[PDB]
Design a protein around this nucleic acid. Structure first.
Ligand code: ADP
Ligand code: ALF
Ligand code: MG
Lengths: 133, 448, 448
DNA sequence: TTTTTTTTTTTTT
């Protein structure tokens, strides 16, 4: 899935959490496991420059630490630039996923009580951006 | 139940990656094939996209779905929904190389496991197959895997890689105080001047008229190669028994006329001189010999490999002579038989990185010409012999042909062909009584 | 549950033979060792005998029981009762050679199975080992099995052995020839050297073009074997009546021009010779000849077994010839029909432990080539004839194809395959008038 | 899978 790579990259590469844009704006219910995803970024922001051990130390006693270590062992990448690029691609995947969800909500709005010219172009423009990426 | 090795996640990565990107196709086609996929649905999908790519058409969900539908494999793989999920799952095609290598590794181990099962089944139930049959079958299966794995990076290397390898070799040669003679010393300084020793991976050919100088000269090369080196030298005497050539060699190293040696007289005055030479040979243990009349290229390759992987590399190989080797399959045509033998000998030299000396006979067309000096075209059952040879030496003695000759006892080696180096002639004195060739210390002529 | 292959009877028979005869313990020890068995107690017993031989004490029931009792192994091996039973199973100590070979064969098969099991273990759980490690491990194991066999004809002879053989044979030759033969006599001394006689359990083959002495040669072998032994010999003449076969034998043994016998234009001297021959044959009375036509592998087995049981074994079996037998079940694919026939004969040969001589024809492609000497690929409908054969002899007579050839009345026996010993050419004199072959007493040209 | 008979092109002695 898309989540396992994301968490695996983050645990293996704690320095990636610094360059993560905020996620609290969108509800975490949309994507499973996204609630802790922003929390890890918040922990990194509160304590910039932390090793993987420090990141795992904060949640040594948590019940989700097993998944973090398991994904860390999985898909081990020696290259760091590739990991950064992959995380960017994975993060880019989430951004359009949020846009797709917004498009779906707009489509439901369309099928509920139609659309007007302003609503049509708004959803229509949103589709182009989603299609472009 | 032991699940056969495979990585579905790795596979789902490459199919999804190839979905997103078409340019990286060659990056995966060189690494994996349809069969290597563990699941039949993946095999069918790989086959379908290969047909799509070979047609010069783009790869996309519509095309792949359409292609599978025409061939009826759309439902067998899962249908349109299954393909859509595969495309969506893969984030990007950046890491498709490692995934492909992993898939190839899984397939190879899967093949190895099946081979292990296959060999085990045969052992349990010989079904009339002898232990040799099982030994041969296992050896073939191991070889087939080894050769399949052999071609990994065989491709059009760029010049930058080629240049770096070459300059390293040149610097190696320059540093080593070889001072000429990069290969095995021939023992004759004049010959080494033009040849610089017998280079590795070469196919040297010594040719002459019947009973002219062939086995005498070739044995001298073998003796010198053994004396001036520390690597075993192999001899294939398909024409005459090992007892006779050893006797000839003992005379050559002792400089005592054969005469009595053939009869078997251990005369004290001479036996003292030869005494010690057997001691020198015994301590060195540098020479291996196998007449085994009527060999085939495969048998020669098998025996050579065993010697190489037992004492460590080879120093030289001698064949006496080329025309006596037989290829069972290509028996109807003699021309093709010689081409197969010549090509095989060149391959063996490359494989073991050791000079290979082969002897050949000439044609009767030589006598017709006024000037009875051999040329490349005089080889017998020839044509393919002179294409693959890296160095060709003809043994000529004008004394035999013209009794009124100035070359009395002075043989001359004519370098008919040399791929890397000049050609010419070198004069050597011929000691028939001792069956030996010696450096021409007398007034030497100059090549035209 | 697959039980590893073994041979309990061979183990028991070998142990008993060793207990009876001690001078042959060295031969058994060299061929097989203690670890070559399948049952641990038998391995313990073999260790006991090896220890006794190292100390030099005689090996027998009393000594074996004493050593086992002192070491506490007497109860492990079932006590002295089983020690006596081990010899009771063994018929004689002379036949220990075959049983030891079976034990070695089972040991090799067991080792192969273990190596195959190890290969599967490593592949199933890589533990991190790279494919190279697995391949290198597999290659090393295969070489161990292939090389841990001893035997002979396994490679090129080195120098030290060659020099000793050269000097040793030179010294012996000028004093005496010292011919060994030491084989199941075929009657021709020159042929015993290259074959060591007709070894039991083999499947010998004789092939040649029509009217080349194929039946003449086989009959000579049958006659010579009959005189030089006491076991009965059997003949299956599917082509010629018993009368014609007997007429040739009378001409051959008595050295009388067979044209006179056929036409009845004999005289008193010839009648005297024939009468002498008939007296000798009736004195022995150990040749059985069947002229039934179109037999089947079942029929020959039933008849051969019946003759053996009535008179206690067969010393030789001759069939004339292979392609004439019939298998109604597989009466659509000739290739499969011949394959079944050849397999059945080999099974019968080992089942009775008696050499089986079968004749065969050759294709017409031989006559197309410039060199008309047969090769193993010329056997007619040779689906599996070459595979099952343990020894193949071809009969050639250059006088047939060349009136002016200097080899008038000279027949060459070309050995195209053999389990032990070399392969070469044996010359003989062919006296067609008497339907006989004779030793080539003339100048023994060196074979190239 | 094997044995048979007909064409046409090459290479060698
Ligand atoms: N009186 C004779 N003089 C000369 N040659 C003979 C005489 N009798 C038989 N032969 C030869 O002996 C050969 C034996 O042939 P045969 O063994 O029947 O052939 P095949 O190898 O098919 O069994 C024949 O080719 C025949 O020419
Ligand atoms: F004469 Al034949 F086989 F050809 F016995
Ligand atoms: Mg016959």
């Amino acid at each position: 899935t898309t989540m396992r790579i994301l968490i695996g990259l983050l645990v293996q590469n704690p320095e990636l959490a610094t360059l993560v844009p905020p996620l609290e704006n969108l509800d975490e219910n949309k994507l499973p496991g996204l609630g802790l995803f922003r929390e890890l970024v918040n922990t990194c922001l509160s304590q910039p420059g932390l090793t993987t051990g420090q990141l795992l130390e904060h949640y040594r006693g948590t019940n989700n630490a097993a998944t973090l270590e398991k994904l860390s062992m999985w898909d081990d990448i020696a290259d760091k630039n590739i990991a950064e690029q992959t995380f960017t691609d994975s993060l880019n995947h989430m951004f359009d996923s949020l846009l797709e969800l917004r498009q779906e909500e707009l489509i439901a709005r369309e099928r509920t009580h139609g659309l007007s010219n302003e609503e049509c172009l708004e959803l229509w423009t949103l589709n182009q951006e989603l299609a472009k990426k | 139940l032991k699940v056969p090795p495979h990585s579905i996640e790795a596979e789902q990565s490459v199919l999804g990656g190839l979905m997103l990107d078409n340019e990286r196709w060659d990056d995966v086609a060189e690494r994996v094939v349809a069969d290597d996929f563990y699941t039949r649905p993946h095999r069918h999908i790989f086959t379908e996209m290969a047909r799509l790519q070979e047609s010069g058409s783009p790869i996309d969900l519509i095309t792949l779905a359409e292609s599978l539908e025409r061939q009826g494999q759309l439902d067998s793989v899962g249908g349109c929904a299954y393909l859509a999920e595969l495309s969506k799952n893969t984030p990007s095609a950046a890491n498709i190389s490692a995934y492909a290598d992993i898939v190839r590794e899984r397939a190879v181990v899967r093949e190895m496991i099946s081979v292990a099962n296959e060999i085990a089944e045969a052992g349990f139930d010989p079904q009339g197959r002898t232990s040799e049959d099982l030994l041969d079958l296992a050896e073939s299966r191991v070889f087939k895997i080894a050769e399949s794995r052999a071609n990994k990076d065989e491709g059009p290397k760029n010049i930058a890689d080629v240049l770096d390898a070459t300059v390293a070799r040149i610097e190696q040669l320059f540093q080593q105080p070889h001072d000429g003679v990069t290969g095995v010393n021939t023992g004759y300084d004049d010959l080494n001047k033009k040849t610089a020793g017998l280079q590795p991976s070469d196919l040297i050919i010594v040719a002459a008229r019947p009973s002219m100088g062939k086995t005498t000269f070739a044995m001298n090369l073998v003796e010198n190669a053994a004396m001036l080196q520390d690597k075993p030298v192999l001899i294939f005497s398909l024409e005459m028994p090992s007892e006779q050539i050893m006797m000839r060699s003992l005379a050559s190293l002792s400089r005592v006329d054969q005469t009595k040696i053939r009869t078997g007289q251990l005369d004290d005055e001479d036996w003292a001189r030869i005494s010690g030479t057997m001691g020198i040979l015994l301590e060195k243990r540098n020479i291996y010999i196998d007449d085994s009349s009527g060999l085939t290229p495969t048998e020669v390759r098998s025996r050579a490999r065993r010697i190489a992987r037992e004492h460590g590399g080879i120093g030289l190989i001698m064949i006496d002579y080329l025309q006596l080797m037989r290829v069972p399959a290509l028996s109807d045509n003699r021309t093709l038989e010689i081409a197969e033998i010549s090509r095989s000998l060149k391959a063996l030299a490359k494989e073991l990185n050791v000079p290979v000396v082969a002897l050949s006979q000439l044609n009767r067309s030589l006598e017709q010409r006024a000037d009875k000096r051999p040329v490349n075209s005089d080889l017998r059952e020839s044509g393919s012999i002179e294409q693959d040879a890296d160095l060709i030496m003809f043994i000529y003695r004008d004394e035999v042909y013209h009794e009124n000759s100035d070359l009395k006892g002075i043989a001359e080696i004519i370098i008919g062909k040399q791929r890397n180096g000049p050609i010419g002639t070198v004069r050597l004195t011929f000691n028939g009584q001792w069956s030996r060739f010696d450096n021409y210390a007398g007034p030497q002529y100059d090549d035209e």
